[PDB]
RNA sequence: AAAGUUGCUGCAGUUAAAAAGCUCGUAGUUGGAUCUCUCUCGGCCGAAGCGUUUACUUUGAAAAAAUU
């Protein structure tokens, strides 16, 4: 179930491993979860003492995880206490090639392996029930940026209560303050 | 005059503007589900289609291309998708 | 054709502020434009601005204040050694108190005072007073 | 503004911000690719392939659903013409105007338009030879025009 | 109407007066 | 030198000196947005490959007096 890149399972990871094992042996989500696997997990405190679990999953299976997202989240919400479940693709950051680097960059790094592409993909993967239909970056008078993400309104009831932990986990994982809105008309 | 919030336009001005002159541009076209009156099958047709699109089973004429939007046949039903 | 988008952004800002407007929309965005506007912002000249992200080169909406008289680009980006700053400011800034030559140096985008303080030169972008 | 026409229109296509594939499209990327394959077997240019896929099969953008644009898909299995479709269309237009000139000698407008078309052909051939799509020995000759069609 | 050079002198003088105007307004802020 | 009457800073070309009938058309000039240091031998260090190469910027050395 868990195959860490460091190959060092933690007890959060083993706990959610038996959690996914319980969901695989009992619920109707048998035929696909057996094929899939994850990599890592972390627990972050956001919103004034409200915890959230994050699950780092290897990239080429996200689309399979995009098929079984909401059902697995609701089943782990039944499984655990009041928490929030989000999935993050394990994205790799290749450093910017400068005039002081090690000789492993014999080809150009892919544009998808850059910092900004990885962070926009991460901000996309934080929100599966919604979709990012807009984005703005407010540069305040102090000089600190603030991203505002406009999500989908047609399904707005699903993730209205989850925007605060979204901002908290993105701030923890990147260091950028973000906010989320819902436009009245597309 | 000389004072209007450019960041938050009310939807009638954004709908009124040219599609490239909107704050973030968006197309005026859409995809639509059409049902032939002689059958029950559903077909996905672009609103501004340039080619004539035939039925997969009835082989009837569904839409005719014009200068802008396509001209659906009198009798076919349609419903805007998403 | 459209070359030197920083020139077009600064011309748009100047023209909008001379007509007494409160906000100005500039397209396309650029990182040089954003750093130039940040340099203005830290000196209290253009309020605060926001970047609108479409999947193209974005747009910027700037909340104009009124303290600016003229912002301008110096094209082409002349090599400015650390002595030439006095010469350049005596050509560009109408006085010794207010006005700013913005330099792109190896330490980033800055103004001429902070260019002197870090003891470096670079290439000249613009000035605003 | 245009290169040679002094008029400056605006009409074009405005791609939406939504790069994600919409939920209602039940076609997979593979089924799109074999649709491209039959369409190419029918003797269709990539532009016509994209037009038919958009008009009938509901594919908004092939690059959004398959991850690659249509010419790379045709290039992977070798169902791609030797020279690109825009150059091919300029060359066909040049042959058509030249045949009309052979029938009609008083049309000086067609002569001027032929000069314009040949100028486009030269500029775009220079661009392609810069990016190695054409071999460096390739040249447009007036008599070597109907053989390319 | 009137000579150009006198108009240029007047424009330069009013712009100079605006320069010390902005300087004094900035000095009063401290 | 006044002189911005040779104009890089810094000029002009409707009516005063002066912009080509029109389009195509080498070279040159100019070009949208985008990408955040290490391996071996010798006492945490020294040698080595540099990291694409530049242009740019800064430092250090070196650089007759007289004149200024």
XYZ file of C-alpha atoms (C1' of nucleotides) in Angstrom:
644
model
C 0.000 0.000 0.000
C 2.786 2.420 0.975
C 6.025 2.579 -1.039
C 7.976 5.598 0.240
C 10.818 6.980 -1.849
C 12.867 7.021 1.348
C 11.413 3.589 2.247
C 10.822 4.668 5.867
C 7.186 4.091 6.892
C 5.904 6.245 9.750
C 3.007 5.269 12.007
C 0.712 7.817 10.356
C 1.547 6.023 7.105
C 0.983 2.568 8.608
C -2.276 3.735 10.178
C -3.629 4.969 6.865
C -2.221 1.801 5.273
C -4.489 -0.332 7.457
C -7.223 2.254 6.803
C -7.010 1.712 3.036
C -6.750 -2.028 3.718
C -10.046 -1.873 5.639
C -11.649 0.058 2.789
C -10.283 -2.442 0.247
C -11.554 -5.526 2.087
C -15.023 -4.157 2.922
C -16.393 -1.478 0.577
C -17.265 -1.701 -3.124
C -13.955 0.015 -4.030
C -12.183 -3.348 -4.294
C -11.197 -3.646 -7.956
C -9.172 -0.418 -8.238
C -7.590 0.296 -4.831
C -5.724 -3.028 -4.978
C -3.979 -1.787 -8.130
C -2.997 1.569 -6.615
C -0.545 2.640 -3.903
C 0.652 5.777 -2.123
C 3.990 7.196 -0.973
C 3.824 9.359 2.165
C 1.584 11.295 4.541
C 1.684 14.176 7.010
C -0.593 15.797 9.586
C -0.895 19.588 9.762
C -2.713 21.742 12.316
C -4.683 24.592 10.707
C -7.553 26.926 11.512
C -7.038 27.087 15.262
C -6.395 23.528 16.369
C -8.141 21.630 13.557
C -5.996 18.881 12.071
C -5.786 17.675 8.488
C -4.169 14.678 6.818
C -2.252 15.007 3.555
C -1.392 11.979 1.418
C 1.505 12.139 -1.038
C 0.724 9.798 -3.946
C 2.970 8.992 -6.956
C 2.163 10.939 -10.102
C 1.103 8.488 -12.872
C -1.845 7.192 -10.804
C -3.505 10.508 -9.822
C -6.067 10.103 -12.608
C -7.047 6.773 -11.079
C -7.194 8.635 -7.768
C -9.198 11.317 -9.593
C -11.839 8.651 -10.218
C -12.070 7.544 -6.573
C -11.473 10.865 -4.795
C -14.768 11.874 -3.185
C -15.876 8.385 -2.114
C -12.533 7.677 -0.452
C -12.563 11.077 1.268
C -16.072 10.544 2.667
C -15.178 7.023 3.820
C -12.086 8.267 5.648
C -14.209 11.052 7.137
C -16.477 8.314 8.486
C -13.344 6.410 9.535
C -11.549 9.193 11.418
C -12.776 12.050 13.603
C -13.531 15.522 12.260
C -10.642 16.077 9.852
C -10.028 16.912 6.204
C -8.501 14.660 3.540
C -6.570 16.065 0.572
C -4.339 14.335 -1.988
C -1.084 15.784 -3.329
C 0.910 14.411 -6.240
C 4.525 13.810 -5.264
C 6.089 16.421 -7.540
C 9.840 16.760 -7.968
C 11.608 20.135 -7.962
C 14.642 20.392 -10.205
C 16.911 23.294 -9.175
C 17.503 26.224 -11.489
C 20.709 25.690 -13.511
C 23.207 28.349 -12.468
C 26.917 28.839 -13.117
C 27.664 26.727 -10.006
C 26.049 23.298 -10.309
C 26.844 19.601 -10.264
C 27.374 17.853 -13.603
C 24.114 15.871 -13.647
C 22.195 18.313 -15.891
C 23.354 17.012 -19.263
C 19.882 17.734 -20.641
C 17.604 20.703 -20.067
C 15.260 20.297 -17.142
C 11.624 19.901 -18.236
C 9.301 22.865 -17.893
C 6.971 20.695 -15.820
C 9.792 20.177 -13.285
C 10.180 23.902 -12.568
C 9.079 25.593 -9.359
C 6.081 27.486 -10.747
C 4.699 24.560 -12.763
C 4.950 22.291 -9.726
C 3.188 24.841 -7.527
C 0.358 25.478 -9.990
C -0.096 21.711 -10.346
C -0.124 21.414 -6.538
C -2.729 24.178 -6.256
C -4.731 22.306 -8.900
C -4.449 18.989 -7.027
C -5.532 20.503 -3.706
C -8.989 21.021 -5.207
C -10.546 18.129 -7.069
C -14.295 18.653 -6.324
C -13.793 22.238 -7.458
C -11.789 23.501 -10.427
C -9.728 26.677 -10.642
C -11.689 28.951 -12.976
C -9.714 32.054 -12.032
C -6.606 33.249 -10.264
C -5.351 36.685 -9.227
C -2.253 37.821 -7.320
C -2.628 40.875 -5.081
C 0.662 42.621 -4.327
C -0.048 44.527 -1.131
C 1.599 47.771 -0.031
C 4.035 45.904 2.222
C 5.296 43.974 -0.808
C 3.865 40.563 0.124
C 1.792 38.695 -2.441
C -1.624 37.132 -1.865
C -3.131 34.687 -4.352
C -6.917 34.616 -4.709
C -8.333 31.517 -6.407
C -11.786 31.562 -7.999
C -13.391 28.108 -7.921
C -16.526 26.613 -9.427
C -19.978 27.793 -8.317
C -22.196 25.004 -9.721
C -20.950 22.557 -7.050
C -20.157 25.234 -4.434
C -21.853 23.426 -1.529
C -19.327 20.561 -1.476
C -16.105 22.375 -0.508
C -17.355 25.616 1.090
C -16.168 24.496 4.538
C -12.853 23.148 3.215
C -11.337 26.395 1.884
C -9.690 27.325 5.191
C -7.769 24.069 5.478
C -6.915 24.454 1.774
C -5.271 27.807 2.484
C -3.579 26.401 5.579
C -2.064 23.384 3.839
C -0.919 25.435 0.846
C 0.685 27.985 3.173
C 2.433 25.193 5.083
C 3.602 23.380 1.940
C 4.737 26.480 0.020
C 4.831 29.577 2.207
C 2.279 31.560 0.179
C -0.922 33.069 1.543
C -3.928 32.099 -0.588
C -7.661 32.814 -0.467
C -10.622 31.256 -2.251
C -13.750 32.864 -3.695
C -16.780 31.835 -5.738
C -17.949 34.102 -8.587
C -21.661 34.766 -8.988
C -21.643 34.277 -12.761
C -19.231 32.519 -15.107
C -17.243 59.134 -14.293
C -13.449 58.658 -13.933
C -14.091 56.131 -11.135
C -15.040 52.502 -11.774
C -13.692 49.274 -10.303
C -12.046 47.572 -13.274
C -11.377 44.430 -11.255
C -15.043 43.648 -10.536
C -17.255 44.336 -13.546
C -20.912 43.525 -13.286
C -21.858 40.596 -15.538
C -23.831 42.570 -18.145
C -20.777 44.593 -19.216
C -18.581 41.492 -19.345
C -21.221 39.702 -21.407
C -21.584 42.803 -23.579
C -17.860 43.144 -24.359
C -16.048 41.542 -27.261
C -14.755 38.086 -26.363
C -11.081 39.119 -26.618
C -11.593 42.410 -24.754
C -12.974 40.728 -21.628
C -10.857 40.873 -18.484
C -10.104 37.181 -18.877
C -11.224 36.168 -22.340
C -13.829 33.475 -22.863
C -15.513 32.139 -26.013
C -19.134 32.832 -26.878
C -19.553 29.318 -28.273
C -20.789 26.162 -26.579
C -21.481 22.485 -27.153
C -25.035 21.214 -27.386
C -26.819 17.859 -27.272
C -29.208 17.306 -30.174
C -31.873 14.629 -30.648
C -33.232 13.813 -34.111
C -37.062 13.672 -34.207
C -36.908 10.465 -36.257
C -34.925 8.619 -33.582
C -33.769 8.791 -29.964
C -29.972 9.093 -30.208
C -28.021 12.002 -28.706
C -25.310 13.829 -30.666
C -22.805 16.407 -29.411
C -22.603 19.326 -31.852
C -20.560 22.521 -31.709
C -22.777 25.611 -31.810
C -20.618 27.292 -34.482
C -19.943 24.142 -36.507
C -18.538 24.632 -40.006
C -19.233 21.158 -41.416
C -22.567 19.446 -41.931
C -23.037 16.819 -39.225
C -25.045 13.715 -40.096
C -26.862 11.258 -37.861
C -24.979 8.089 -36.972
C -28.086 5.956 -37.473
C -30.619 7.990 -39.433
C -28.064 9.808 -41.658
C -30.352 12.855 -41.626
C -29.208 16.465 -41.809
C -28.829 17.779 -38.266
C -27.124 21.167 -38.601
C -26.296 23.411 -41.532
C -23.272 25.730 -41.314
C -23.954 29.447 -41.712
C -21.914 32.594 -41.138
C -22.169 32.247 -37.370
C -24.044 29.587 -35.439
C -25.182 26.453 -37.238
C -28.768 26.163 -38.478
C -30.414 23.144 -36.872
C -33.090 21.281 -38.810
C -36.708 22.118 -38.009
C -37.740 19.201 -35.825
C -34.490 18.456 -34.020
C -34.354 19.187 -30.305
C -31.338 20.570 -28.494
C -30.166 21.239 -24.970
C -27.146 23.317 -23.983
C -24.443 21.232 -22.362
C -22.759 22.417 -19.150
C 4.955 45.989 -33.628
C 4.816 45.719 -29.851
C 8.354 45.770 -28.474
C 9.438 46.870 -24.985
C 6.267 46.171 -23.005
C 7.710 48.114 -20.051
C 7.665 51.235 -22.233
C 4.016 50.658 -23.104
C 3.096 50.004 -19.468
C 4.812 53.185 -18.274
C 3.260 55.240 -21.076
C -0.184 53.876 -20.170
C 0.319 54.658 -16.465
C 1.529 58.194 -17.218
C -1.317 58.908 -19.653
C -3.955 57.560 -17.265
C -2.640 59.479 -14.269
C -2.417 62.763 -16.182
C -6.143 62.381 -16.929
C -6.812 62.033 -13.189
C -7.868 58.385 -13.143
C -8.045 56.147 -10.080
C -7.159 52.793 -11.697
C -5.275 51.731 -14.814
C -5.289 48.415 -16.686
C -2.046 47.394 -18.397
C -1.499 44.405 -20.674
C 0.610 42.369 -21.166
C 2.205 41.719 -17.786
C 5.899 40.961 -17.353
C 8.226 40.229 -14.457
C 10.199 43.396 -15.246
C 6.946 45.377 -15.169
C 6.051 43.813 -11.811
C 9.458 44.590 -10.292
C 9.323 48.162 -11.650
C 5.865 48.657 -10.139
C 7.098 47.170 -6.861
C 9.942 49.710 -6.867
C 7.362 52.479 -7.330
C 5.118 50.934 -4.655
C 7.800 50.788 -1.958
C 8.316 54.534 -2.452
C 4.570 55.254 -2.234
C 3.863 56.346 -5.805
C 1.275 53.965 -7.290
C -0.677 52.565 -4.351
C -1.019 48.810 -4.705
C -1.557 46.708 -7.810
C -2.882 43.262 -8.615
C -1.922 40.710 -11.281
C -4.762 39.072 -13.214
C -3.851 35.558 -14.356
C -5.132 34.355 -17.658
C -3.155 31.550 -19.254
C -1.436 34.114 -21.507
C 0.801 36.961 -20.442
C -1.353 38.394 -17.694
C -2.793 41.821 -16.973
C -2.168 44.241 -14.118
C -4.661 46.598 -12.475
C -2.889 49.451 -10.676
C -4.618 51.730 -8.154
C -3.237 55.174 -9.001
C -2.713 57.713 -6.214
C -1.641 61.060 -7.664
C 1.850 61.697 -6.328
C 3.445 60.772 -9.664
C 4.235 63.437 -12.265
C 6.038 61.379 -14.908
C 7.315 57.817 -15.097
C 9.471 56.888 -18.056
C 11.644 54.241 -19.666
C 15.174 54.804 -20.954
C 15.498 52.815 -24.168
C 17.908 51.186 -24.961
C 19.140 49.793 -21.657
C 22.405 51.686 -21.446
C 25.312 50.328 -19.441
C 25.477 52.416 -16.270
C 28.723 52.224 -14.324
C 28.687 53.311 -10.707
C 30.145 56.750 -11.450
C 27.741 57.477 -14.324
C 24.784 57.570 -11.903
C 25.481 61.189 -10.966
C 25.704 62.084 -14.657
C 22.577 60.074 -15.400
C 20.577 61.664 -12.626
C 21.707 65.126 -13.653
C 20.334 64.251 -17.074
C 17.112 62.667 -15.867
C 15.892 63.765 -12.460
C 14.876 67.458 -12.380
C 16.125 67.878 -8.791
C 18.164 66.265 -6.026
C 15.212 65.314 -3.774
C 12.633 63.296 -5.726
C 12.991 61.166 -8.836
C 14.235 57.665 -9.492
C 16.450 55.912 -11.966
C 15.621 52.214 -11.805
C 18.518 49.880 -12.555
C 18.599 46.211 -13.407
C 21.779 45.084 -11.650
C 23.212 41.690 -10.799
C 21.573 42.155 -7.379
C 18.134 42.569 -8.989
C 15.833 45.483 -9.745
C 16.511 48.545 -7.608
C 16.652 52.332 -7.617
C 19.797 54.437 -7.883
C 20.161 55.084 -4.145
C 20.036 51.370 -3.330
C 22.332 50.831 -6.312
C 24.894 53.117 -4.667
C 24.386 51.494 -1.266
C 25.120 47.975 -2.535
C 28.048 49.383 -4.595
C 27.106 48.107 -8.033
C 25.956 49.274 -11.436
C 23.812 47.794 -14.142
C 21.505 48.736 -16.989
C 19.042 51.603 -16.860
C 15.311 50.931 -17.122
C 13.397 54.007 -15.989
C 12.801 56.970 -13.690
C 9.761 58.396 -11.973
C 9.144 61.712 -10.253
C -2.326 44.435 -38.788
C -1.833 41.916 -41.583
C 1.449 41.506 -43.456
C 0.297 42.903 -46.774
C -3.359 43.778 -46.426
C -3.546 47.177 -44.674
C -6.693 46.101 -42.814
C -6.466 45.053 -39.169
C -9.220 42.703 -38.050
C -9.702 41.062 -34.681
C -11.630 37.874 -35.476
C -9.905 34.807 -34.034
C -10.510 32.016 -31.544
C -10.495 32.657 -27.792
C -9.465 29.585 -25.822
C -11.193 29.357 -22.426
C -9.311 29.396 -19.144
C -10.546 25.859 -18.403
C -7.799 23.540 -19.636
C -9.390 20.503 -17.976
C -11.394 18.054 -20.067
C -15.133 18.500 -19.376
C -16.965 15.756 -17.525
C -19.589 15.064 -20.194
C -17.005 13.884 -22.744
C -16.995 10.105 -22.386
C -14.420 9.642 -25.155
C -10.945 8.690 -23.980
C -7.664 9.980 -25.380
C -7.119 6.719 -27.260
C -10.481 6.787 -29.075
C -9.608 10.355 -30.100
C -6.293 9.085 -31.487
C -7.895 6.393 -33.672
C -10.419 9.023 -34.793
C -7.392 11.064 -35.898
C -6.063 7.942 -37.619
C -9.179 7.262 -39.719
C -9.449 10.984 -40.472
C -5.852 11.038 -41.733
C -6.515 7.896 -43.780
C -9.374 9.803 -45.435
C -6.797 12.265 -46.814
C -7.425 15.097 -44.342
C -5.121 17.912 -43.287
C -4.621 18.415 -39.517
C -6.802 21.545 -39.557
C -9.695 19.611 -41.094
C -9.102 16.833 -38.554
C -9.433 19.284 -35.674
C -12.487 20.918 -37.244
C -14.325 17.606 -37.671
C -13.351 16.451 -34.171
C -14.646 19.711 -32.701
C -17.851 19.839 -34.746
C -18.981 16.221 -34.396
C -17.032 14.267 -31.761
C -17.181 16.965 -29.087
C -13.395 17.228 -28.685
C -12.817 20.826 -27.603
C -9.019 20.715 -27.949
C -6.990 17.626 -28.855
C -4.064 19.002 -26.845
C -6.217 19.178 -23.698
C -7.578 15.615 -23.910
C -4.614 13.747 -25.408
C -1.737 15.899 -24.148
C -0.295 16.479 -27.628
C -1.361 18.523 -30.620
C -2.537 16.885 -33.811
C 0.604 17.169 -35.951
C 2.702 15.360 -33.338
C 0.083 12.594 -33.197
C 0.250 12.234 -36.980
C 4.051 12.398 -36.825
C 4.348 9.577 -34.275
C 2.901 6.972 -36.644
C 4.216 8.685 -39.771
C 0.825 9.727 -41.173
C 2.140 13.239 -41.832
C 2.764 14.883 -45.225
C 6.299 15.748 -46.279
C 5.643 19.511 -46.301
C 3.249 21.446 -44.037
C -0.344 22.284 -44.879
C 0.035 26.075 -45.070
C 2.867 25.831 -47.601
C 0.808 23.237 -49.488
C -2.169 25.607 -49.652
C -0.036 28.551 -50.810
C 1.457 26.328 -53.513
C -1.979 25.138 -54.690
C -3.181 28.746 -54.799
C -0.118 29.688 -56.858
C -0.823 26.895 -59.373
C -4.468 27.968 -59.660
C -3.605 31.627 -60.290
C -0.850 30.630 -62.728
C -3.222 28.445 -64.762
C -5.721 31.316 -64.832
C -2.906 33.566 -66.087
C -2.168 31.037 -68.819
C -5.795 31.315 -69.905
C -6.096 35.083 -69.218
C -3.230 37.451 -70.052
C -4.910 40.809 -69.339
C -5.381 40.022 -65.617
C -2.648 42.160 -64.096
C -4.357 41.822 -60.715
C -3.775 38.065 -60.824
C -0.124 38.744 -61.671
C 0.187 41.029 -58.636
C -1.544 38.484 -56.395
C 0.806 35.805 -57.744
C 3.762 37.974 -56.717
C 2.212 38.311 -53.249
C 1.615 34.552 -52.903
C 5.147 33.732 -54.061
C 6.503 36.212 -51.512
C 4.592 34.389 -48.762
C 5.954 31.093 -50.116
C 9.532 32.373 -49.955
C 9.224 33.762 -46.416
C 7.587 30.638 -45.022
C 10.065 28.371 -46.818
C 12.887 30.382 -45.237
C 11.254 29.822 -41.851
C 10.854 26.074 -42.378
C 14.407 25.602 -43.673
C 15.563 27.445 -40.563
C 13.767 24.843 -38.398
C 14.796 21.878 -40.615
C 11.274 20.897 -41.718
C 12.391 21.334 -45.340
C 15.744 20.137 -46.701
C 18.228 22.948 -47.442
C 18.079 22.267 -51.193
C 14.302 22.782 -51.451
C 13.215 25.622 -53.723
C 9.913 26.757 -55.199
C 10.051 26.949 -58.990
C 7.114 28.113 -61.097
C 7.365 25.011 -63.294
C 8.013 22.807 -60.222
C 4.562 23.612 -58.813
C 2.006 21.165 -60.223
C 4.288 18.245 -59.325
C 4.030 19.080 -55.603
C 0.223 18.822 -55.704
C 0.059 87.047 -29.252
C 3.185 86.939 -27.080
C 6.709 85.617 -27.752
C 7.542 81.929 -27.395
C 10.607 82.539 -25.218
C 8.581 84.368 -22.571
C 6.052 81.503 -22.566
C 8.903 79.018 -22.137
C 10.290 81.043 -19.226
C 6.825 81.093 -17.623
C 6.349 77.330 -18.056
C 9.794 76.625 -16.593
C 9.073 78.919 -13.629
C 5.680 77.364 -12.866
C 7.189 73.866 -13.077
C 9.983 74.944 -10.728
C 7.400 76.366 -8.304
C 5.606 73.007 -8.445
C 8.942 71.297 -7.687
C 9.479 73.207 -4.431
C 5.735 72.803 -3.808
C 6.038 69.001 -3.816
C 9.285 69.216 -1.822
C 7.696 71.379 0.891
C 4.619 69.134 1.040
C 6.943 66.145 1.478
C 8.977 67.981 4.131
C 5.841 68.840 6.123
C 4.955 65.124 6.316
C 7.954 64.287 8.535
C 31.127 79.701 -26.621
C 26.310 81.942 -26.867
C 24.012 77.572 -30.655
C 19.240 72.706 -29.400
C 22.334 76.326 -36.856
C 25.032 69.080 -37.126
C 21.121 67.807 -32.235
C 24.178 60.681 -28.542
C 22.448 63.746 -24.624
C 19.281 67.186 -27.992
C 16.747 69.552 -33.789
C 13.468 69.339 -37.711
C 10.278 67.613 -42.618
C 0.797 69.961 -43.640
C 1.008 75.376 -44.719
C 8.316 78.248 -43.774
C 14.814 74.131 -46.078
C 12.541 69.076 -46.337
C 8.430 62.462 -46.798
C 9.841 58.515 -51.837
C 3.157 57.028 -57.260
C 2.040 52.175 -55.011
C 2.995 47.120 -53.398
C 6.519 43.215 -53.071
C 11.383 43.042 -52.001
C 18.926 41.002 -49.499
C 21.824 42.520 -45.674
C 21.846 45.515 -41.276
C 18.978 47.504 -37.042
C 15.024 45.942 -33.619
C 12.195 42.020 -31.644
C 5.660 39.332 -26.873
C 5.070 36.333 -22.308
C 7.484 32.159 -19.664
C 12.278 28.316 -16.288
C 13.696 29.797 -7.824
C 28.390 23.078 -7.423
C 30.742 18.622 -6.770
C 34.327 14.071 -7.377
C 39.324 12.094 -5.935
C 44.356 11.966 -3.245
C 47.168 14.920 0.941
C 46.658 18.506 6.359
C 36.553 21.102 8.751
C 40.093 22.111 4.388
C 44.067 22.306 -0.054
C 44.691 20.636 -5.558
C 40.966 18.904 -9.993
C 36.149 19.103 -13.594
C 34.069 23.477 -13.642
C 28.761 25.474 -13.817
C 26.969 26.227 -21.749
C 29.729 30.314 -23.586
C 29.226 35.339 -23.640
C 27.733 40.638 -23.477
C 27.080 43.586 -18.640
C 28.722 45.063 -13.581
C 32.183 45.181 -9.447
C 36.880 44.178 -7.017
C 42.317 43.571 -6.960
C 47.065 44.279 -9.259
C 49.762 46.996 -12.606
C 49.958 51.786 -14.804
C 56.635 58.587 -16.378
C 57.165 63.216 -14.597
C 55.354 67.991 -15.755
C 50.385 69.989 -16.498
C 45.110 69.789 -14.039
